[PDB]
Amino acid sequence: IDNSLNTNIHQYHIVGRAIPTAKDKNPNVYRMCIFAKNDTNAKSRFWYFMKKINKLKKSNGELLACEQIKERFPLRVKNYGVLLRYDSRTGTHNMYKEFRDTTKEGAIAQLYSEMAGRHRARASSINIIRISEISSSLVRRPHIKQLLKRRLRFPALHLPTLQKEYRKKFASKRPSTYRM
């Protein structure tokens, strides 16, 4: 239960094979990791890739395993690099982008948020090919490179946003945006 609120989307290891036949008595086993909102969606995404890659379809295959993946440490930061193929209005484009997070799932959430925000690209039009941990020295993006410096601080960059109780319509004196 916890008390925890925001942000959800999960990681699944799915394994499947072609249905056994007289013609082939030892089907090829195919495995993939898939980021999805649930197991049924994860199976469908696996099937879409199985259909695109192989000539296998749900009617001609069998599930060997499907199991949810949990990240090794929830609170230790890693730099995840993700390679995407996405579709524009005209056609197809490739991108490999870098995200600092404690979770691969969080990095995918940032990626979907970026693809939506910077290109107006819909979830349907994205294909994730590999998300993996990248060393600090190796990183291309300057926005991730800046985080990786020796020392970091800010004088508070964010406006207040008090609880509903204290968002009342009238104030007694003029306030300030933030303390110095």
Binding site: N3, L75, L152, P155, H158, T161, Q163, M180
Partner: protein, 146 residues
């Protein structure tokens, strides 16, 4: 040889900005179900989000949240790269940060409000009674003073 000039530096150092978002600074949560608990900023994930960890006295668990949900407090104790719950608990006990917060004016305003809200009807009447007594004496002094 860096140690010879320092009297001047100490004498003339003043800067308006304070309460920097640097690891090990005490912060008051102002949004979400954890609001009104105080906590440390551990690591910084990215520009909007930070890794927060309450004191084990405040009891808000270690977690990622947006920095926007915090109001930073005066205190900071310098800390290592990662947390550790035990070492944080030992260091917080050593430096007495809650006591310092409580001694600070905002802590005083909060604890006075908390006590006042939870007070009994008899306690509330006693406060009313005491103020009524006080007003009588104050008016008596003001009349006498004339």
């Amino acid at each position: 040889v860096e140690l010879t000039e320092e009297e001047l530096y100490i004498s003339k150092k003043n800067l308006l900005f304070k309460r920097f978002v640097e690891p090990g600074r005490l912060c008051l949560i102002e949004y979400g179900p954890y609001a009104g608990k105080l906590c440390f900023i551990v690591d910084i994930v990215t520009i909007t989000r930070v890794i927060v960890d309450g004191a084990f006295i405040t009891g808000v668990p270690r977690m990622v949240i947006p920095l926007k949900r915090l109001k930073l407090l005066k205190e900071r104790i310098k800390i290592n790269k990662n947390c550790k719950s035990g070492f944080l608990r030992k260091t917080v006990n050593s430096t007495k940060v809650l006591e310092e917060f409580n001694n600070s004016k905002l802590g005083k305003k909060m604890i006075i409000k908390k006590k006042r809200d939870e007070a009994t009807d008899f306690e509330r009447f006693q406060v009313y009674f005491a103020k009524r007594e006080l007003k009588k004496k104050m008016t008596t002094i003001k009349n006498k003073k004339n």
